[PDB]
């Protein structure tokens with residue numbers, strides 16, 4: 451049984467590189483000199499040379515920082531060969547799981563979202579629902595969890611802050627009375643989406659609200 455438990459490595463490691471991860475050891479090295487090697491995507495096939503193993507010592511090395519959103523999991527195989535050329539172990543399955551950091555900003559699905567209401571809708575009326583996605587994890591962390599907010603409203607008649615947005619759903623609602631198509635037939639809202647549920651970084655898009663006739 452030549453085996454190694456799965457290894458989890460956060461993306462965007464600071465190093466220094468190369469970074470030791472685990473030492474591969476065959477116990478057949480008491481009988482002879484052993485040369486270690488690694489194969490698989492990330493080792494000997496694309497992306498090549500992300501991982502390596504030190505020939506004499508069997509230290510598995512990470513050569514550069516990982517990116518979860520490029521490759522989230524690696525399956526490599528370790529090999530142990532004697533000086534006389536015989537493989538002395540069955541190849542070792544080496545599992546490497548890349549864990550998340552918050553390194554993607556949210557992205558709105560559209561640059562412009564449009565919706566419309568009747569002029570006489572009451573306060574609390576839902577206008578439209580906007581959406582932003584985030585490529586980071588949102589299962590175990592907030593890296594991928596978006597909070598929505600309104601950035602600003604034009605024009606500011608009959609007053610400002612006439613709309614709100616649901617922080618989690620992105621539903622934009624009317625919160626004031628005083629819509630009047632004859633005075634202001636359309637509002638341009640700049641809307642924001644922020645990750646870490648409001649504590650992280652932020653992107654913007656526009657929502658245009660038409661007051662119907």
Ligand SMILES: [Ca+2]
Nearest residue numbers: 517518519553
């Ligand atoms: Ca990344």
Ligand SMILES: [Ca+2]
Nearest residue numbers: 551552553586
């Ligand atoms: Ca990430």
Ligand SMILES: [Ca+2]
Nearest residue numbers: 554586593645
């Ligand atoms: Ca993010």
